[PDB]
Amino acid sequence: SKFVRKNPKSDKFKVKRFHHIEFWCGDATNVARRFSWGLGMRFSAKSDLSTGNMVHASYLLTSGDLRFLFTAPYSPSPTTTASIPSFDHGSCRSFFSSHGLGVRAVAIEVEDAESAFSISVANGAIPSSPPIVLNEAVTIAEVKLYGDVVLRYVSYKFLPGFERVEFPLDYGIRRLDHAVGNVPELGPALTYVAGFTGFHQFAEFESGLNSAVLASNDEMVLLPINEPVHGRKSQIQTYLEHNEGAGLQHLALMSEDIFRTLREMRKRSSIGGFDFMPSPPPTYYQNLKKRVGDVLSDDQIKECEELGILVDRDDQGTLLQIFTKPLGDRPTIFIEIIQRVGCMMYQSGGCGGFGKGNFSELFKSIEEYEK
Amino acid sequence: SKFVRKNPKSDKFKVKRFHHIEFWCGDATNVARRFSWGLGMRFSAKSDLSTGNMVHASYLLTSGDLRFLFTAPYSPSLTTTASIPSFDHGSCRSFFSSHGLGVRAVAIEVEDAESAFSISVANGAIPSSPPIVLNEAVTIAEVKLYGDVVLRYVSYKFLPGFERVEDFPLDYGIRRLDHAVGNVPELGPALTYVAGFTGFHQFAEFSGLNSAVLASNDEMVLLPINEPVHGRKSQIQTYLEHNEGAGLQHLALMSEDIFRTLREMRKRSSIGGFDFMPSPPPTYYQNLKKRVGDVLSDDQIKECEELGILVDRDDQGTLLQIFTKPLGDRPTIFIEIIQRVGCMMYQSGGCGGFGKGNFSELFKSIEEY
Ligand SMILES: CS(=O)(=O)c1ccc(C(=O)C2C(=O)CCCC2=O)c(Cl)c1
Ligand SMILES: CS(=O)(=O)c1ccc(C(=O)C2C(=O)CCCC2=O)c(Cl)c1
Ligand SMILES: [Co+2]
């Protein structure tokens, strides 16, 4: 009858919000133009040959506060002209050859990235890139998160050496909600990240998985981590094979109206955008009526059925969510579109949870639908 | 007042059509999806995990008879399951790391690919992939064209291992591939190399570059080759530096109505499609009404101006063309859309040439104005 949650607000440095996601590409242009059309994100900044960067090509797409950065190495034929200082062709080519299209870097704003970096390394973080001040403006540092993903710190006083790009595109995507990594072993990954960050544990209510969510003090930076359960097979085990180890599994994208967004995105799956996981049976939506009846009107339940949208509830609020098919060649990274309703006071982070209860709700309605 | 062409029809094996182009990618899925929307090409066939292929991902777009194959290597941890028998992980990753996104293979239908291959290698051709017969249906061979591009021979009796994709659908008028142009450091050697093993003849010409066009007996397979002229800097040199050697410069796509195609493609430039080269000044389109006004109505002139379409003439016919910006990160491969008008007798290949004349016409319209 009552679910109680604790939060020791034990961040070791001041953390603000997600800043950007950096994908490592083979060709940044075609990936950036695919994502731009498929998600309704505007071309906003660039650092390439047209701006003087002869080391790497990097395009920034934005949608409200969401920033997707796409970076590809040029031919080596030194690094002075590069704008992102942690970059080198060897690590890029290795990453791509080993994992294919995927997230290299999850970037969080912090108060002081040099502060954030030294506290992290003192508490166990494996450094990947030390603090660099770019043009006495922004400071950027990087530490290993899991596998080949880096956590990147960004602090201020898009980036120096980027040029801005001038009715544009917008399907309602407003911000990144959470970024989820797949690891072989929850326990050590958790003690390692929680060890250097001080992020606390967020709460709960076959799956093939064990999950735990790491959260900053205000629970606005959310980092869930999944482990495969051995012994139908775990998609997470499947992820680890095709991704050649740990790596980022999915990004959830918060929308201000998931119906508009889903309408826009489903218009474009067959003309260059993203395809979606097959939708629940009709029994799943008959059961919505009185499981969230008090939050969704009957017209919005008809809307979820037309769009294949999943709904979940926890102690605080309600979550509307839908999962995209893998973004590239391998069955590795995919995207989630979500809208959280409730928990207003501003809206609190994790309002509605992460959809864990939809495993049963999907299985229940699939076995209901046969009979 | 008269231009005379010769054609020794000296092909050494029977050649039919441009069959497909194969791009080698980092990620086949995004490139193919981008090309699909920008060009109006249907997802036609595929060979990948969902088909059992654990070696490479390969997607086929088609528009009319034009076929674009996009191929990328999967992880080697997971080669009999591959459907393209010339594929190996190492070569692909070296290619992409050396050249970026680009064309790996120009494929032509030949009567018999093992015959075509054996005659080529005796007459100088460097082999890359020996004849392989697939499921007793199609034979496949590759010799070296220039740089890391191979000329690929296909003969029959899309490919075994490909599953068809069901699709309302996408179509902007692209109907076939017209020519495919390589950039090399030294025209002469490459010409004698390629012409030596094909028997292809020189199709004749009615700056920054020297070019010659090798054609098949019926001149339906057309392969121009560019050389940089040294000492404004040669865009062919710029190509050679950024692609790290010889490689394919552009593919010209024949459209059955370039006006239709361009309205479709320019609408999509800012929403994922392709952008175009800056268009000529207005004097270019004023000097058109007295240069091609016997072929295009005044309303078609106004249509070329609205779309930045270039027009040239030659002895037999008239060519409508326009060029795209570079397709990937590097300023290397780009696309051209063309429509040939004239030369009916079916239409003869190369009716109108290749746009040699527009260098002069673009300069002089710019000195005017
Ligand atoms: C197969 S499903 O029931 O529709 C479902 C639900 C939540 C999710 C995820 O967003 C959550 C969550 O985003 C964090 C990690 C634990 C999960 O499973 C996923 Cl990937 C799939
Ligand atoms: C600079 S332009 O007048 O727009 C022009 C014309 C022809 C072409 C080419 O299609 C032809 C032709 O495709 C190959 C032989 C040499 C050329 O220049 C190009 Cl890339 C540009
Ligand atoms: Co051309």
Query: What are the b/e assignments for A149-159, b being 16+ CB within 10 Å?
Result: bbbbbbbeebb
DSSP state at residue B328: S
- Residue B271 has its nearest CB partner, among A37, A96, A100, at A37
d(CA A104, CA A149): 5
Strands A209-215 and A222-228, bridge-based pairing: antiparallel
Give CA–CA dist B120/B214, Å, rounded: 15
Q: Which residues, judged by CB distance below 6 Å to any ligand atom, belong to the binding site of ligand 2?
A: B 179, 181, 211, 224, 226, 250, 252, 310, 323, 336, 354-355, 358-359, 362
Nearest to A27 by CA among A73, A81, A87, A69: A73
Q: What is the chain A residue with the closest CA to B272? A: A33
Q: Which residues pair with A324 in a beta bridge?
A: A276
- Beta-strand relationship, B127-134 and B138-146: antiparallel
- Residue identified by tokens 């260059």 is A272
d(CA A232, CA A272): 31
What's the CA gap between B333 and B120, in Å, rounded?
27
Cα separation of B32 and A356, whole Å? 34
Residue of A337, A362, A13 lying closest to A198 (CA atoms): A13
Choose the residue to mutate in A176, A320, A333, A359 for probing ligand 1, maximizing ligand atoms within 8 Å of C-beta. A359
- Given a contact cutoff of 8 angstroms between Cβ atoms, the answer to whether A264 and A166 are in contact is no
> Among residues A30, A353, A240, A281, which one has the least CA distance to residue B70?
A30
Tokens representing B309 are 């379409």
Which residues of chain B does A26 touch, with a Cβ-Cβ cutoff of 8 Å? 25-27, 96, 100-101
Report d(CA A61, CA A58) in Å as an integer. 10
Nearest ligand to the C-alpha of residue B355?
A: 2
The residue length of chain B stands at 369
Strand bridging mode B334-342 / B317-323: antiparallel
* Contact assessment for residue B336 and residue B252, using Cβ atoms and an 8 Å cutoff: yes
Q: How far is B124 from chain A (nearest CA, A)?
A: 31
Closest-CA residue in chain B for A166? B270
Determine whether the annotation assigns residue A20 to a binding site: no
Q: Which residue has the tokens 């290698």?
A: B121
Tell me the CA distances in angstroms from B242 to A72, B72, B97, B336, one per residue in order.
Answer: 14, 21, 12, 20
User: Could you give the CA distance from residue A191 to residue A197 in angstroms, rounded to a whole number?
Assistant: 10
Phi, then psi, of A168 in degrees rounded to 5:
-75, -165
Q: Using CA positions, which residue lies closest to atom 12 of ligand 2? A: B354
End-to-end CA distance of chain B: 30
Alpha helix locations (H) across B133-257?
A: 187-198, 235-243
If you ran DSSP here, which 8-state letter would residue A308 be given? T
Q: Nearest CB to B26: which of A26, A169, A244?
A: A26
Q: Which residues of B touch A33 (CB under 8 A)?
A: 34, 38, 272-273
Determine the 3-state secondary structure of A25 from DSSP.
coil
Tokens at A45, concatenated:
């900044």
Asked whether the beta carbons of residue A34 and residue B34 sit closer than 8 angstroms, the reply is yes
Radius of gyration over alpha carbons of chain B, in Å?
20
Which contiguous run of DSSP H or E holds residue B163? strand B163-164
Question: For residue B94, what is the enclosing H or E element?
Answer: helix B89-99
Residues 6+ apart with CB under 8 A from A354: A178, A211, A213, A224, A319
- What contacts A117, CB < 8 A, 6 or more positions away? A127, A130, A131, A141, A143, A153
How far, in Å, is the centroid of ligand 3 from the Cα of B252?
Answer: 5
| Tokens at A168, concatenated | 């544009």
Helix (H) or strand (E) holding A104: strand A102-110
Contact state of A328 with B167 under an 8 Å Cβ cutoff: no
Residue B329 touches partner A, C-beta closer than 8 Å: yes
> CA A273: distance to chain centroid?
18
Side-chain-facing half-sphere of A2: CA atoms under 13 Å? 1
Cβ pair A328:B27 closer than 8 A: yes
Q: Is the C-alpha dihedral spanning B75, B76, B78, B83 positive or negative?
A: positive
Interchain pair B33, A272: CB under 8 A? yes
Instruction: Please tell me what DSSP assigns to residue B12.
Output: S
**Resolution of the coordinates, Å:** 2.4
Instruction: Give the β-pairing of A310-313 and A317-323.
Output: antiparallel
DSSP state of A325: P
Measured CA distances, B137 to B80, B134, B150 (Å): 17, 6, 22
The set of long-range contacts for B201-204, using a CB threshold of 8 Å and a minimum separation of 24, is B201/B6, B201/B7, B201/B8, B201/B9, B201/B10, B203/B5, B203/B350, B204/B3, B204/B5, B204/B6
B108 vs B142: CA distance, rounded Å: 10
- Closest CB from B98, B100, B170 relative to A27: B100
Residue B367, helix vs strand vs coil = helix
Q: 67-96 in B: which are within 8 Å (CB) of A? A: 72, 74-75, 77-78, 93, 96
Compute CA distances B155 → B18, B83, B179, whole Å: 12, 16, 20
> Which one of B25, B33, B44, B94 would you mutate to disrupt binding with A, by most A Cβ within 10 Å of its Cβ?
B33
Ligand 3 geometric centre to CA of B313 (Å) = 14
| Lining residues, ligand 1, CB within 6 Å | A 178, 180, 211, 224, 226, 250, 252, 310, 323, 336, 354-356, 358-359, 362
| Cα of A121 to nearest chain B Cα, Å | 33
Query: Which of B329, B330, B333, B335 to mutate to test binding with chain A, by most A CBs within 10 Å of its CB?
Result: B329
Contacts of B101 in chain A (CB under 8 A): 26-27, 30
- Between the CA of A347 and the centroid of ligand 1 the distance, in Å, is 21
Question: A75 to chain B: which residues are within 8 Å by CB?
Answer: 98, 100, 242, 244, 330
Residue B320 contacts residue B310 (beta carbons within 8 Å):
yes
**A98 and chain B: CB distance < 8 Å anywhere?**
yes
d(CA A117, CA A109): 12
Distance A357 CA to ligand 1 centre (A): 9
CB A264 within 8 A of CB A171: yes
CB contact under 8 A, B25 and A29: no
Three-state SS at A44: strand
The pair of structure tokens assigned to A104 is 């290299």
User: Exposed/middle/buried for A58, CB within 10 Å: 0-12, 13-18, 19+?
Assistant: buried
HSE-CB of A249 using CA atoms within 13 angstroms: 24
Cα–Cα distance between B296 and B292 in angstroms, integer?
Answer: 6
Q: Which atom of ligand 2 lies nearest, measured to the CA of B334?
A: 20
One-letter amino acid of A183? V
| DSSP3 helix / strand / coil % (chain B, rounded to 5) | 25, 35, 40
Contacts of B272 in chain A (CB under 8 A): 33-34, 36-38, 272
DSSP codes joined into one string, B22-90: EEE-S-HHHHHHHHHHHHT-EEEEEESGGGT--SEEEEEEEETTEEEEEEEE--TT--TT-SSTT--HH
H or E element that contains A197: helix A186-197
Query: DSSP letters along A137-194, please?
Result: TEEEEEEEEETTEEEEEEE----TT-EE------SSEEEEEEEEEE-S-HHHHHHHHH
Burial B319-344 (b: 16+ CB within 10 A, else e): bbbbbbebbbbbbbbbbbbbbbbbbe
Q: Tell me whether residue A99 is annotated as binding.
A: no
CB contact under 8 A, A34 and B33: yes
Distance A33 CA to ligand 3 centre (A): 25
User: CA end-to-end span of chain A, whole Å?
Assistant: 32
- Among candidates B148, B127, B128, B129, which has minimal Cα distance to B140? B129
**Using CB atoms, which residue from A33, A74, A242 is nearest to B34?**
A33
Task: Name the DSSP letter for residue A248.
Answer: E
Q: State the Cα–Cα distance between residues A177 and A233, nearest whole angstrom.
A: 28
- Which one, of B312, B317, B301, B318, lies nearest residue B355 by Cα? B312
Question: Beta partners for A323?
Answer: A336
As a whole number of angstroms, the distance between CA A151 and CA A225 comes to 14
- The shortest C-alpha distance from B98 to chain A (Å) reads 7
SS3 B321: strand
Q: Does A26 touch chain B (CB under 8 A)?
A: yes
State whether A330 and B101 contact (CB < 8 Å).
Answer: no
B129 sits in which H/E element = strand B127-134
Dihedral of alpha carbons B114, B116, B121, B127, sign: negative
Of B72, B78, B98, the CB nearest to A329: B72
Q: Are B73 and B89 in contact (CB under 8 A)?
A: yes
> What is the rounded distance in angstroms from the CA atom of residue A262 to the CA atom of residue B290?
53
Q: Which domains does chain B have, with CATH numbers?
A: 1-171 (3.10.180.10), 172-369 (3.10.180.10)
B27 and A272 in contact by Cβ < 8 A?
no
The two tokens of residue A146 are 């899991």
Q: What is the dihedral of CA B136, B140, B141, B147, to 10 degrees?
A: -160
Rounded to 5 degrees, φ, ψ at B195 are -60, -30
For an interface test with B, the pick among A23, A25, A34, A235 (most B C-beta atoms closer than 10 Å) comes out as A34
Count of A–B CB contacts within 8 Å?
105
Is A178 part of any known ligand binding site?
Answer: yes
Nearest in space to B128 (alpha carbons), one of B102, B91, B101: B91
Number of CB atoms found within 10 A of residue B189's CB: 12
| Rounded Cα gap, residues A354 and A318, in angstroms | 10
List alpha helices for A10-137, DSSP H: 28-39, 89-99, 113-122
